[PDB]
Amino acid sequence: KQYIISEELISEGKWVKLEKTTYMDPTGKTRTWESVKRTTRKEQTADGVAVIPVLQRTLHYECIVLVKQFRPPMGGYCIEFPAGLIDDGETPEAAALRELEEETGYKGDIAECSPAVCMDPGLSNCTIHIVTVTINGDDAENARPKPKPGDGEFVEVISLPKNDLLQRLDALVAEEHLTVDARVYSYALALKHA
Amino acid sequence: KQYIISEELISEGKWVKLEKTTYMDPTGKTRTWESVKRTTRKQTADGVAVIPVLQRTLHYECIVLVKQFRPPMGGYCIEFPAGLIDDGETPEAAALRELEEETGYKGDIAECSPAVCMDPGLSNCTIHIVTVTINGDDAENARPKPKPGDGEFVEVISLPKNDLLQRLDALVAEEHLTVDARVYSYALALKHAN
Ligand SMILES: CNC(=O)c1cnc(C)s1
Ligand SMILES: [Cl-]
Ligand SMILES: [Mg+2]
Ligand SMILES: [Mg+2]
Ligand SMILES: [Mg+2]
Ligand SMILES: [Mg+2]
Numbered sequence: 001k002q003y004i005i006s007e008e009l010i011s012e013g014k015w016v017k018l019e020k021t022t023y024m025d026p027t028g029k030t031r032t033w034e035s036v037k038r039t040t041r042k043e044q045t046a047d048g049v050a051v052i053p054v055l056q057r058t059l060h061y062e063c064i065v066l067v068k069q070f071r072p073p074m075g076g077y078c079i080e081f082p083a084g085l086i087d088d089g090e091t092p093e094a095a096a097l098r099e100l101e102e103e104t105g106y107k108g109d110i111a112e113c114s115p116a117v118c119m120d121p122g123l124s125n126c127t128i129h130i131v132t133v134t135i136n137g138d139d140a141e142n143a144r145p146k147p148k149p150g151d152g153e154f155v156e157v158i159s160l161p162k163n164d165l166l167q168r169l170d171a172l173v174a175e176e177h178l179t180v181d182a183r184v185y186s187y188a189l190a191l192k193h194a
Numbered sequence: 195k196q197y198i199i200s201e202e203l204i205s206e207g208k209w210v211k212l213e214k215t216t217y218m219d220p221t222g223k224t225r226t227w228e229s230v231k232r233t234t235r236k237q238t239a240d241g242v243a244v245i246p247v248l249q250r251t252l253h254y255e256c257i258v259l260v261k262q263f264r265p266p267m268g269g270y271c272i273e274f275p276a277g278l279i280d281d282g283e284t285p286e287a288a289a290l291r292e293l294e295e296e297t298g299y300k301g302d303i304a305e306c307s308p309a310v311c312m313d314p315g316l317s318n319c320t321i322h323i324v325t326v327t328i329n330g331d332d333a334e335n336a337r338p339k340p341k342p343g344d345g346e347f348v349e350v351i352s353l354p355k356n357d358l359l360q361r362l363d364a365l366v367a368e369e370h371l372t373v374d375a376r377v378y379s380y381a382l383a384l385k386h387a388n
Contacts, residue, residue, distance in 0.1 A: 194387030
């Protein structure tokens with residue numbers, strides 16, 4: 001029933017733009033919306049990847065590997081799945097494994113890759129692939145993981161046990177000023193609910 | 195170590211604005227970021243998203259989701275019921291209200307997250323994730339009345355909790371919809387648990 005009629009640029013930065021979207025509603029009436037888009041999406045199937053990294057080690061409980069960084073939009077520190085934008089020509093899987101190594105030091109193994117999923121669809125067209133990766137923490141490659149941050153990347157690694165993830169996140173939020181990401185929280189809530 | 199120095203308005207719509215954020219990197223170098231914010235916040239968070247667990251005896255437990263056209267996406271998305279929190283509304287009340295408006299179901303609060311970020315590399319947007327149970331055997335949820343506001347057009351899709359991720363992939367394959375990242379993350383963790 002519904003579709004886009006026109007997309008009028010309001011303001012274009014180097015990374016993000018704002019558009020006036022005109023669309024047809026299902027009564028047959030024309031309406032508008034304010035839409036955010038990135039300027040960096042070329043032929044990628046999504047803007048970015050977020051990695052769900054399951055750290056597996058003999059005689060350890062499985063951990064979920066998370067990262068903590070300063071996020072200028074939020075004006076503060078956030079706890080997130082490792083993530084980054086997909087480089088031109090790069091596959092989502094390759095982007096995931098690369099970002100996971102850059103942000104955490106770990107070399108993972110692909111498990112699964114989602115279709116493109118929407119970040120905040122009432123606001124933006126932004127999409128990611130959610131890529132589940134296992135990390136063999138018994139491998140020597142992953143014994144001394146050194147994050148290789150790119151320019152302006154400053155990332156702390158936080159590994160939390162899967163079997164207590166929500167409470168461990170709660171305990172971090174209780175101790176400092178820091179926001180947990182909605183996908184991380186959602187994943188932690190389902191681990192509780194299962 | 196990191197903090198905001200200043201924020202310069204680039205462009206302000208009725209609902210969304212774009213800013214150029216100046217911040218201090220951990221080395222003492224000053225850097226800029228393009229940030230999006232909503233113009234609507236007052237509140238604990240911009241919005242709520244509801245995880246609605248429909249419980250009917252002798253049936254599988256379902257998670258109630260909504261399908262709507264999303265102008266920034268140019269398409270239909272599958273999402274947790276959700277909306278912005280009204281000035282002077284609590285997140286719990288916003289959650290029960292939105293759930294009723296979007297689905298017609300009347301639920302009970304199970305738990306409420308702290309404010310969690312939507313896409314912290316892009317925006318300051320936050321929500322509370324509110325887990326709600328729905329007694330599907332109660333008379334008031336027999337023939338649920340969805341009460342849309344002006345210009346809302348929402349379809350309800352109930353999916354079994356125990357097979358959520360496979361049911362979502364199926365919808366994506368057959369119906370060319372985009373699943374929401376928080377929905378997909380929750381679905382993943384239901385499979386990954388134990
Ligand atoms: C790296 N510098 C930037 O200004 C941005 C990157 N991603 C954005 C949404 S803004
Ligand atoms: Cl529950
Ligand atoms: Mg990143
Ligand atoms: Mg990165
Ligand atoms: Mg809504
Ligand atoms: Mg509503």
